[PDB]
Amino acid sequence: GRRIQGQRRGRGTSTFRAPSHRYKADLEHRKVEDGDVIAGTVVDIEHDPARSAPVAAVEFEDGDRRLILAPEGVGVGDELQVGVSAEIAPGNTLPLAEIPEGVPVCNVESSPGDGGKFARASGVNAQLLTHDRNVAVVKLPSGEMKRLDPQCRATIGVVAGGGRTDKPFVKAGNKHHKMKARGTKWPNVRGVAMNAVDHPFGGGGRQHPGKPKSISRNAPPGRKVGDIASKRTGRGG
Amino acid sequence: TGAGTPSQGKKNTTTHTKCRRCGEKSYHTKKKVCSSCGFGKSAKRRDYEWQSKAGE
Amino acid sequence: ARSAYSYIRDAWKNPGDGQLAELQWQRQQEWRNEGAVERIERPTRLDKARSQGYKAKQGVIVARVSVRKGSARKRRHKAGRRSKRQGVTRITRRKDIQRVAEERASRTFPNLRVLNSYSVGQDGRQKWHEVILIDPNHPAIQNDDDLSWICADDQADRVFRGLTGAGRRNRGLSGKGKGSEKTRPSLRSNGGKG
Amino acid sequence: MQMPRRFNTYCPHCNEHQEHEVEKVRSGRQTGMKWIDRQRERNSGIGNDGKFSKVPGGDKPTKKTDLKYRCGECGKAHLREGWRAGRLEFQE
RNA sequence: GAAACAUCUCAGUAUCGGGAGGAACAGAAAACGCAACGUGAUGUCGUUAGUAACCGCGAGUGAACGCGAUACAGCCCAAAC
RNA sequence: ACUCGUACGGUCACUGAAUCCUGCCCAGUGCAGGUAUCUGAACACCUCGUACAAGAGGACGAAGGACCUGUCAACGGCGGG
RNA sequence: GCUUUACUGCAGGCUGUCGCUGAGGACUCUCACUCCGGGAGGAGGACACCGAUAGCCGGGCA
Numbered sequence: 001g002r003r004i005q006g007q008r009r010g011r012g013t014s015t016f017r018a019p020s021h022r023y024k025a026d027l028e029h030r031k032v033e034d035g036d037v038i039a040g041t042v043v044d045i046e047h048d049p050a051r052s053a054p055v056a057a058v059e060f061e062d063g064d065r066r067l068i069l070a071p072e073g074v075g076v077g078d079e080l081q082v083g084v085s086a087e088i089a090p091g092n093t094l095p096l097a098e099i100p101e102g103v104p105v106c107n108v109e110s111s112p113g114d115g116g117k118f119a120r121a122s123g124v125n126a127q128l129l130t131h132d133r134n135v136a137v138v139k140l141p142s143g144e145m146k147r148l149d150p151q152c153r154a155t156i157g158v159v160a161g162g163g164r165t166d167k168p169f170v171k172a173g174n175k176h177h178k179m180k181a182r183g184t185k186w187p188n189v190r191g192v193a194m195n196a197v198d199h200p201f202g203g204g205g206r207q208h209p210g211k212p213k214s215i216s217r218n219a220p221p222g223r224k225v226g227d228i229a230s231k232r233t234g235r236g237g
Numbered sequence: 238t239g240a241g242t243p244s245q246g247k248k249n250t251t252t253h254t255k256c257r258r259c260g261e262k263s264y265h266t267k268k269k270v271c272s273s274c275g276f277g278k279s280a281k282r283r284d285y286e287w288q289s290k291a292g293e
Numbered sequence: 294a295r296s297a298y299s300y301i302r303d304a305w306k307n308p309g310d311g312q313l314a315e316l317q318w319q320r321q322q323e324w325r326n327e328g329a330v331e332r333i334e335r336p337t338r339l340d341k342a343r344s345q346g347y348k349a350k351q352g353v354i355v356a357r358v359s360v361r362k363g364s365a366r367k368r369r370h371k372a373g374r375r376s377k378r379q380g381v382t383r384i385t386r387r388k389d390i391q392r393v394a395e396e397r398a399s400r401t402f403p404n405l406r407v408l409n410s411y412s413v414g415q416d417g418r419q420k421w422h423e424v425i426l427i428d429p430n431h432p433a434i435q436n437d438d439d440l441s442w443i444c445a446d447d448q449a450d451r452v453f454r455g456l457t458g459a460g461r462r463n464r465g466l467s468g469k470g471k472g473s474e475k476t477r478p479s480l481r482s483n484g485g486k487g
Numbered sequence: 488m489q490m491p492r493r494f495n496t497y498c499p500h501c502n503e504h505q506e507h508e509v510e511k512v513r514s515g516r517q518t519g520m521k522w523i524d525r526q527r528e529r530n531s532g533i534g535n536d537g538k539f540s541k542v543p544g545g546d547k548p549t550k551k552t553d554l555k556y557r558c559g560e561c562g563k564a565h566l567r568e569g570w571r572a573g574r575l576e577f578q579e
Numbered sequence: 580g581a582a583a584c585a586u587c588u589c590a591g592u593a594u595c596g597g598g599a600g601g602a603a604c605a606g607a608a609a610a611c612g613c614a615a616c617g618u619g620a621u622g623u624c625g626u627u628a629g630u631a632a633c634c635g636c637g638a639g640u641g642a643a644c645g646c647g648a649u650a651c652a653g654c655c656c657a658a659a660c
Numbered sequence: 661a662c663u664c665g666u667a668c669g670g671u672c673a674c675u676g677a678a679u680c681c682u683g684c685c686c687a688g689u690g691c692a693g694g695u696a697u698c699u700g701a702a703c704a705c706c707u708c709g710u711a712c713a714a715g716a717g718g719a720c721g722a723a724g725g726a727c728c729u730g731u732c733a734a735c736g737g738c739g740g741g
Numbered sequence: 742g743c744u745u746u747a748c749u750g751c752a753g754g755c756u757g758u759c760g761c762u763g764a765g766g767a768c769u770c771u772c773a774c775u776c777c778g779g780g781a782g783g784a785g786g787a788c789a790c791c792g793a794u795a796g797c798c799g800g801g802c803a
């Protein structure tokens with residue numbers, strides 16, 4: 001048959017790429033030698049086209065002007081600090097070790113100095129639970145307990161723009177506009193609505209998958225479709 | 238819209254042009270590659286054994 | 294008495310033992326950070342180089358080349374093929390890695406010609422060979438009785454036509470009797486069955 | 488059918504009648520060093536292996552008798568034509 | 580093609596990548612093995628021979644040594660000192 | 661490539677606004693988890709064989725399978741008497 | 742052209758083993774190698790990656 005849509009994706013053609021040239025900033029934590037003597041002032045609050053969430057323009061002491069992944073409650077004029085000795089207030093960034101347990105955090109680093117990887121989407125947050133000289137246990141937004149190096153930096157507070165998901169798109173056009181700002185092909189044609197040549201579920205006199213939807217982890221691309229290595233399906237039991 | 242005559246009307250785009258290297262009207266001005274001599278793609282001249290019968 | 298060279302040779306008989314072992318473990322760290330073709334001032338295996346024709350003279354060049362280990366980096370068929378021709382994984386190229394190394398070196402030095410080459414080890418994913426190249430235009434070579442032969446026009450691009458020692462062995466020309474029916478005088482004249 | 492374990496009959500070796508013992512031919516073990524074994528290894532490669540890609544045929548409803556007739560005095564055996572028999576049991 | 584077809588065959592062919600010359604390539608034996616008290620670098624031509632060898636032992640595939648010719652040519656390093 | 665992205669994410673599928681709802685079935689097939697025991701290749705290892713080798717056998721045993729469990733808004737099923 | 746528990750194979754995934762590969766049937770370490778860090782250095786570590794091979798799955802494809 002023909003390559004399935006999921007296979008066309010990987011080639012990285014225009015249709016599947018994110019409108020990168022239209023994006024504003026790669027939101028990473030600043031690098032500080034040590035000491036913490038790095039503070040800046042929020043100069044503006046802007047919309048981030050890559051995340052449908054606000055972002056903050058900060059002007060640092062040493063003349064550096066950069067956009068920052070903004071937590072809720074950050075405003076123009078506010079002074080933010082980054083470093084070991086940073087104050088424990090919303091919007092500041094310091095290593096997990098300097099953060100008091102039980103405090104909501106966002107933009108958590110996976111490896112110390114990577115600029116942040118976890119809890120960055122609208123209104124989310126990680127929960128710093130356990131401290132130690134060896135490991136800082138953080139609960140990610142998915143509910144998972146993550147063991148991290150206490151040296152991994154993070155920002156105090158929950159990510160801004162919380163509740164974005166609360167409102168329905170209502171119409172195709174609204175989804176369309178959002179989709180145009182992402183690396184995604186939309187709308188979505190169901191496999192079962194296609195011809196056999198185009199998809200493992202295509203074909204038939206009526207619409208139905210011709211086999212069980214639960215596919216093995218070992219299935220090759222072009223065949224891995226439907227419910228991937230599902231431990232279970234449905235709602236009952 | 239018919240794919241024949243009615244679709245022939247929008248054809249006012251210049252692509253293949255007189256090539257600087259071979260003189261043939263094959264230099265694709267959009268690609269900057271001559272489809273006849275290979276100019277723009279290779280220093281060596283474009284040529285293939287299939288351009289003639291196998292035993293010739 | 295034993296030449297000093299015999300000691301370099303003897304060391305290389307077992308590159309995984311003694312001082313040489315420690316040397317290789319240290320060197321390869323630097324080699325893996327070097328490029329595909331690196332010109333080196335002196336051969337790592339002096340005895341082997343001299344044995345192959347090397348001379349500490351003007352116009353004699355040495356370069357270490359790294360080439361990946363393993364079989365053919367082959368693409369699977371994209372059209373009809375009988376089962377026999379559908380393979381990908383087990384197919385190996387007909388030119389040995391040493392020969393690939395020699396060509397990569399000669400390309401790097403377009404004006405030079407390959408004289409010979411030898412192995413200098415390997416790690417888990419690549420092999421290194423040092424190639425001895427010669428400047429057929431330098432008068433220090435045009436006047437050398439032992440090397441001037443390489444200056445002749447018919448020796449141009451000798452490596453690309455398999456006229457190298459590794460080229461000739463890989464072409465099955467080693468034996469002069471049984472087994473060389475389809476190799477001598479050339480693979481092509483024998484219908485490509487060698 | 489039933490059949491005597493021992494009985495008098497012609498021995499092609501002694502060249503005279505003598506008591507023979509009848510035994511069912513036990514399959515001899517293969518060595519894996521016959522020419523066909525070497526051809527299997529040699530010729531098997533990428534893709535279909537021709538004859539070596541085939542699998543064991545079926546079964547006839549009844550098989551013929553596969554026996555050894557051993558001379559009770561010279562100890563030398565001889566073979567005979569078999570005949571179709573669903574079952575073959577020896578008497579004693 | 581095998582009166583299907585998979586190994587086999589078409590064929591190392593078509594086609595593709597790299598490169599030399601006026602011709603290329605090969606070449607002075609870790610050869611041959613008419614086993615010898617024998618031959619004596621290498622191409623090529625004739626023959627050996629559709630022989631030996633391969634092969635769903637099917638269809639097909641397919642040398643060599645030697646011999647008669649052509650032309651003839653034999654050398655340089657590495658190391659020892 | 662997704663991605664100047666990080667689970668309020670984005671990938672892979674099914675259904676197809678709202679309203680009232682969405683029963684029973686895990687035997688087969690699929691996916692997934694577990695598994696005393698059974699089965700389970702090659703290397704290395706042990707025995708036999710061979711002055712070596714081919715080869716025969718053993719021991720150990722991964723994923724997988726048997727076996728057990730979960731799962732139908734998973735493929736699907738919801739009869740005769 | 743298409744399908745599949747048709748025949749035969751081929752990618753791909755999983756898994757053992759060998760090489761890279763090192764020191765003291767469960768374990769410690771650091772020196773290759775990998776990743777993070779501008780750097781200092783940190784994490785991981787003879788595993789993984791990669792090369793080779795073996796078993797299972799394998800109309801994704803011929």
Ligand SMILES: [Cl-]
Pocket residue numbers: 178
């Ligand atoms: Cl969305």
Ligand SMILES: [Cl-]
Pocket residue numbers: 399405406407449450451452453
């Ligand atoms: Cl060359």
Ligand SMILES: [Cl-]
Pocket residue numbers: 511551552553554575
């Ligand atoms: Cl019988």
Ligand SMILES: [Cl-]
Pocket residue numbers: 618
């Ligand atoms: Cl002779």
Ligand SMILES: [K+]
Pocket residue numbers: 375
């Ligand atoms: K064919």
Ligand SMILES: [Mg+2]
Pocket residue numbers: 025026027028664
């Ligand atoms: Mg970014």
Ligand SMILES: [Mg+2]
Pocket residue numbers: none
């Ligand atoms: Mg939704």
Ligand SMILES: [Mg+2]
Pocket residue numbers: 014015016017179180182183184185
């Ligand atoms: Mg788009």
Ligand SMILES: [Mg+2]
Pocket residue numbers: 188189190
């Ligand atoms: Mg749809």
Ligand SMILES: [Mg+2]
Pocket residue numbers: 193194195
């Ligand atoms: Mg349709």
Ligand SMILES: [Mg+2]
Pocket residue numbers: 001196197199200
């Ligand atoms: Mg299909």
Ligand SMILES: [Mg+2]
Pocket residue numbers: 207
């Ligand atoms: Mg429907």
Ligand SMILES: [Mg+2]
Pocket residue numbers: 207208
């Ligand atoms: Mg349906």
Ligand SMILES: [Mg+2]
Pocket residue numbers: 240
């Ligand atoms: Mg048309």
Ligand SMILES: [Mg+2]
Pocket residue numbers: 478482604
């Ligand atoms: Mg010739």
Ligand SMILES: [Mg+2]
Pocket residue numbers: 531532533534535536
């Ligand atoms: Mg095979």
